[PDB]
């Protein structure tokens, strides 16, 4: 409910962080250096030894004690709204937990990150034939993942078109409860990155020539289904056509690589005009977004020292 | 009024058929039509068709990337006839030569950027360091940093040995360059050791941090000489290389649009294996001109001008406004809104029949008038200056013709606005104070006016009666509009609903002013019962649940007139209050600061103005806007769109 | 006049007061969703100005009572 | 002609002009805010968001007719 | 005046003083989203003082309505 | 003066309370977005200084209306 | 009070779909019935008047 | 009023760093100008009771 | 005013379980204090009258 | 105001499902016992006078 | 209208863990200090009644 | 009305943490020295009346 309560908690852990210039002197070590800097970072209070695996234990450790508080401490609508921000690892979870239903792995098959909740709904919904019954033992009552679920749960029991189709309902749900909310500069990095992740899976499933309405959801501001269709056809102009909204430097590029770091550059950005919302929940969201861009430069960091990698190879990292 | 937009058929050769599209593009009359899966092929021309026209939409667009770069703008003007290979050598050596000279002047501004920093603090560092800089015994490592806290960072330095590790500033107050001189490998350490108290060497860009500090320094002076001169040279060959290409840069992007607009329309032609059709929708008011561009095919190749399809289903079909030139200045704010059905009434003409009635029953102050007559002169001069209504203010770029088209309509508004001023017998304010013009009852001293605008007694009670007769005349007109496009479109559900809101509105309005208006409510009674016995015989043949919330809605479209009369006493009476008080503070003291009254309280009127018409004036088209096509529908299909060739010019 | 015209006109003040701060409390919200559906689309505009000026007609029942009150006055 | 009924008349029509002004602030704070926060969007939507800004003065334009019509009838 | 005229300055003072609530009220909103705007660019200060400064016209009636009961005190 | 003198001035003091209300009511939400930006940027002191003074003119109408009334009481 | 919130809903889910504005539109009219029903008492107040 | 919104902002403030507190306990005394002239109305009222 | 945010925080927790339905709904009457009070005070002004 | 939160918690809860509509509805009804108490009031005033 | 606030978090605690009941209570509890200074000015006026 | 956040945020904390009792009961009982001021207001008038 308070999002002042947990935003001074949230403004002190903005305090404390690992700045851009530690990744900067992290740019020439071996990982003994690298393992030394961050041994001094928050990484360094989970840093068990050496190594990419501890040190990736590590990170995720500490992206686990700076996060899933920001589940805890909040009860209510701010409670929804926090819990519709950390939906990465939690929809990944469910999509490993169906995909291990509809596959026949074990239960122990699956290394299950931390979701958003507790990880024995996962362990009870191992043992679930029903998945209706499976998403009633996972229903939280503000987990629209739950709901998703129960809405694309009278298709089929267990299929990959209904995994697919579930996951659109998913964003399409995540943006109801967006709109659904006292809280525009949230909706907007919302319907930003629902528009940049129908951009991309649409640049990635390029030339299927399958069924764009299948692909493009609805809630997109930037483009539209005629755009998507021209995007996804063979044709750059329509990322010409992104002119004047947050696609800004994206233009005349027919890539995957550079155009996914041009898109995290994008919601970078705009995440970083997060700070103008004091007492909402933007300067939550620009934090857990600006640990999530240090910790993947940090894994990033000790691969690079792991495999001996280029600078230069990493020196389209840094810039974000 | 909706035009034809007729259908014409067309059959011709593959390459007729380009000579025939080049004309009908450059007889840019007719928006195209699809209709490729009817028997034939989807004209799919040619892939190396495709190839040229990709070719020439790369040219257009480096077209205008090189007006961007030179900083053009897409100015469009005659064409210019030539190859297109002529074109690319055209168009790519002034293209080259503006983008190199952009990169270049890019990077001598960020070298100017990155040498007025660092070029008296590396000088004075080098300075210090004379003698130390590259000799292989020990690093100088200095650090940029902060005001006189020295001994926070020079606690490292203690740390590490005693008769050097010499860590201080001795110039460049500012940011005061800490060097530290140890040793090399130690003064690597000691490096680390100031880092983890705090710090950072400079490591600059470029070669001032990848040489020696002595070299550093007199390239970054021989940068800071170099920029000034090259940038100048390059902003001057840069303007005088855009002054001397953006004519045949614009002519070339003119063909360049011309005949990818060509390709694009070629495009969704329909072609029959040597032989192609073609369709499209023309008005009927240029027929002449499309038979006449028909008869210049190779032998005027077989077609064909058919009728377009009726009031009923004529979807993908456009229209059109068709307006007289008397009405035709208000189409920009019809257009504001959605299309009509091709069969859906324009209202367009009662924009100018009824705004500016209202807006000059609004605005009764005929110094406000003549201010809008001083600003219509300027815009006057502006249009007869021709140029582009740019205001980088608004960031506003308006055509001429929306300007003109603005002037006209300030002038007819005007018009009724000084007719209605005399009838409210006011100006700028209340100049009466002095000079009473406009006689009263109470202060006869000269011709009188038909309302004195101060009084409410009488004045106020035929305001609201004669704003409500109009209102409900709009909505009687709304409903019969209503009620005759559901019997053109024969559709008797919108008919029926018509006819049962506007025998809904008269019951509940002769019972209003029966019960609670005047006296001899047994003529009426009938008429009150007949009213809600046609709003229930309406209801019971619509069967449709149309409750009493739409009969509701449009008593209050028809009650929402009474604010366009509140608006006007509003305005009138904090004009009359601020001429009254600038009166009594210039004349009524003393008659001393009559000029200096007058001019704070003309200052002040013409900011209350300024904060005061805008929304009174957008008060009356809103209402129209809402209560107008709400009643005449007009949220249906929003029409389709009439776009034929363009042929840009 | 008297007495019972000013407390009459009290009441007309109040009524009127009170209404238009219903009407203005409900045209925020509306206008608030209209805005935002008007940032999202541009084409919506047709049904945006009608669902924000259907509050109206609570100011206009209040409209008609003072101008019953003032012809009690 | 009472020496009360005016006052009292007065104070009618200061509460309604207090309390329009008051709903057509409350109704202004959110209209101004998505107004603010679409120009911070785009600089291309000015007209409807100030069409929509000023659409609330029809209140206080009312309000101020009602205190029109106390003080003439005063 | 004894009764009349304490009266019509307690009804104006009541009027000025919800008018100036009313538009502190929308100031608040309004100056929140304009600070926004500012702390996003400075490049449309003209149009968040626009926007702020329409919320004037309210305490100009306001005052206006004030001045009515001075001239009518 | 009396109860017209004692109602002038309950009048006066009441514009002048929710004059400073109001002004408050925009200053909770103008102080918060300003400390805001100030957390944001140090670079941004003076133009949101002017957006937070700019609800002052409230306050001072009814202060100078409060004097208007003590030079009428 | 309620129309806030209740036109606010309405216009949302009419962005969302304009298939239901008869339903949005029956859901923000709800409301009225208190006007109705004040406007019934003050009809009772001024037939006692 | 205000000083709910702005001692909240300045504590948040304060908990992000303790190197902008001055400033923001200067804007967080900022809310007394109203309290200043509600004093000298109250002061200008008790000397012409 | 106590009753709407605490019963609609039971009524999230009864969404969560239906377990602790007697710990909500205690929670939930807890507020009845002020309406026994209010009935004492009421009853004793009418004896005082 | 206590009907406000517990029918909007209850709306969310029985648009998730079907499963404690009754329970739901007895958590709205909690709030009429105030309403009860007023009207008993309001009886014993009417009495009185 | 600390209450609402109170009872809702007491309860978002009760979810969160029913070990945490008696702390909650106390925290629920900690508000009624006004109300019985309210009805002790209410007994202290009847006894000046 | 300074209890409701008051008690809130100390409750949110309790259910952090049992060891966070302390401080924040003295942030809770912080807020009763304007009751203190109010009582001694009405200890005033009941010796003045």
């Given amino acids: ?320 | 009024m909706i035009a034809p937009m007729e259908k014409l058929v067309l059959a011709g050769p593959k390459g007729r058929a380009k000579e025939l599209l080049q004309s009908l593009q450059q007889a840019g009359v007719v928006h195209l039509e699809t209709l490729r899966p009817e028997a034939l092929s989807a004209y799919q021309l040619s892939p190396e068709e495709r190839a040229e026209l990709r070719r020439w939409e790369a040219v257009s667009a480096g077209a205008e990337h090189t007006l961007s770069l030179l900083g053009l703008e897409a100015e469009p003007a005659r064409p210019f006839p030539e190859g297109l290979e002529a074109a690319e050598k055209a168009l790519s050596p002034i293209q080259a030569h503006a983008e190199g000279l952009t990169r270049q002047k890019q990077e001598l501004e960020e070298e100017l950027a990155l040498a007025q920093a660092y070029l008296e603090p590396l000088e004075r560092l080098a300075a210090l360091a004379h003698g130390l800089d590259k000799s292989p015994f020990l690093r100088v490592i200095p650090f940029l940093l902060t005001e006189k806290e020295l001994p926070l960072v020079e606690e490292a330095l203690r740390k590490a040995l005693e008769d050097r590790y010499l860590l201080a500033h001795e110039a460049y107050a500012g940011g005061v360059a800490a060097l530290v001189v140890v040793h090399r490998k130690e003064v690597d350490q000691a490096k680390a050791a100031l880092s983890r108290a705090g710090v950072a060497e400079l490591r600059l860009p470029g070669a001032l941090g990848e040489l020696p500090l002595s070299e550093a320094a007199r390239r970054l002076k021989e940068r800071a000489e170099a920029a000034p001169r090259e940038l100048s040279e390059v902003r001057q060959h840069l303007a005088k290389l855009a002054r001397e290409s953006a004519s045949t840069l614009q002519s070339l992007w003119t063909r360049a649009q011309d005949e990818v607009a060509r390709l694009k329309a070629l495009e969704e032609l329909a072609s029959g294996r040597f032989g192609f059709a073609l369709l499209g929708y023309v008005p009927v008011k240029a027929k002449p001109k499309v038979e006449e561009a028909l008869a210049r095919h190779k032998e005027s190749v077989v077609y064909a001008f058919e009728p377009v399809d009726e009031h009923h289903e004529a979807d993908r079909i456009p229209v059109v406004l068709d307006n007289p030139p008397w009405a035709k200045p208000f189409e920009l704010l019809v257009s504001f809104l959605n299309t009509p059905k091709y069969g859906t009434f324009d209202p367009t003409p009662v924009v100018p029949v009824f705004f500016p009635f209202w807006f000059g029953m609004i605005v009764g102050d005929i110094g406000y008038a003549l201010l809008f007559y001083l600003v219509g002169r300027w815009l006057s001069g502006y249009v007869k200056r021709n140029e582009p209504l740019v205001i980088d203010l608004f960031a506003l770029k308006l055509k001429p013709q929306v300007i003109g088209k603005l002037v006209h309509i300030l002038n007819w508004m005007v018009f009724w606005t000084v007719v209605w001023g005399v009838i409210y017998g006011e100006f700028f304010g209340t100049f009466l104070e002095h000079l009473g013009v406009f006689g009263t009852p109470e202060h006869p001293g000269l011709i009188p006016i038909l309302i004195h605008r101060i009084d409410t007694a009488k004045t106020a009670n035929l305001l609201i009666l004669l704003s409500v007769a109009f209102g409900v005349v709009l909505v009687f007109f709304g409903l019969a509009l209503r009620a005759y496009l559901g019997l053109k479109h024969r559709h008797m559900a919108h008919f029926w609903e018509g006819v049962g809101y506007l025998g809904g509105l008269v019951g509940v309005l002769a019972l209003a002013a029966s019960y609670l208006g005047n006296l001899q409510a047994g003529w009426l009674q009938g008429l009150m019962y007949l009213g809600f016995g046609v709003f229930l015989l309406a209801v019971l043949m619509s069967r449709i649940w149309l409750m009493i919330p739409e009969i509701f809605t449009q008593a209050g479209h028809i009650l929402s007139h009474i604010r366009i009369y509140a608006v006007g006493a509003a305005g009138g009476i904090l004009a009359g209050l601020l001429t009254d008080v600038g009166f009594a503070l210039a004349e009524r003291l003393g008659l001393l600061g009559v000029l200096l009254g007058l001019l704070v309280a003309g200052v002040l009127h013409l900011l209350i103005l300024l904060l005061t018409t805008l929304g009174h004036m957008l008060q009356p088209i809103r209402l129209l806007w809402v209560e107008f096509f709400t009643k005449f529908g007009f949220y249906e299909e929003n029409g389709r769109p009439y776009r034929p060739f363009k042929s840009v010019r | 006049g008297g007495l019972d015209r000013g407390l009459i006109a009290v009441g007309m003040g109040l009524a009127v007061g009170l209404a238009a701060l219903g009407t203005g409390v409900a045209q925020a919200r509306i206008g608030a969703a209209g805005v935002g559906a008007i940032a999202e689309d541009r084409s919506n505009f047709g049904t945006a100005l009608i669902f924000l000026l259907l509050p109206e007609t609570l100011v206009i029942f209040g409209l008609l009572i003072a101008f019953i009150l003032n012809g009690r006055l």
């Fill in chain 1, 1 to 320: 409910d308070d999002f002042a309560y947990l935003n001074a908690r949230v403004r002190v852990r903005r305090g404390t962080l690992l700045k851009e210039s530690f990744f900067q002197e992290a740019l020439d070590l071996s990982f003994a250096d690298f393992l030394r800097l961050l041994s001094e970072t928050v990484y360094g209070g989970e840093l068990a030894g050496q190594g990419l695996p501890d040190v990736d234990r590590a990170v995720l450790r500490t992206q686990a004690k700076l996060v899933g508080d920001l589940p805890r401490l909040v009860t209510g609508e701010a409670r929804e709204a926090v819990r519709l921000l950390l939906l990465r690892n939690d929809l990944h979870n469910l999509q490993a937990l169906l995909r291990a239903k509809a596959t026949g792995r074990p239960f122990e098959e699956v290394l299950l990150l931390p979701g958003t909740l507790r990880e024995e709904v996962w362990r009870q919904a191992y043992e679930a034939q029903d998945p209706a019954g499976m998403a009633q033992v996972l229903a939280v009552p503000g987990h629209p993942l739950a709901r998703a679920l129960r809405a694309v749960l009278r298709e089929t029991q267990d299929l990959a078109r209904v995994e697919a189709l579930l996951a659109k309902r998913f964003f399409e749900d995540v943006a109801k409860a967006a709109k659904g909310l006292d809280q525009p500069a949230l909706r907007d990095y919302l319907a930003l990155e629902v528009d940049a992740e129908n951009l991309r899976t649409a640049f990635k499933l390029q030339g299927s020539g399958l069924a764009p309405d299948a692909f493009f959801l609805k809630g997109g501001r930037f483009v539209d289904r005629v755009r998507f269709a021209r995007l996804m056809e063979g044709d750059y102009a329509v990322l010409d056509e992104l002119s004047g909204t947050p696609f800004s430097g994206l233009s005349g590029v027919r890539d995957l690589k550079a155009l996914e770091r041009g898109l995290r550059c994008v919601l970078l950005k705009e995440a970083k005009k997060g700070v103008q919302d004091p007492l909402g929940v933007g300067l939550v969201l620009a934090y857990v977004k600006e640990r999530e861009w240090e910790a993947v430069r940090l894994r990033l960091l000790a691969r690079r020292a792991y495999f001996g990698l280029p600078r230069a190879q990493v020196e389209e990292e840094v810039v974000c």
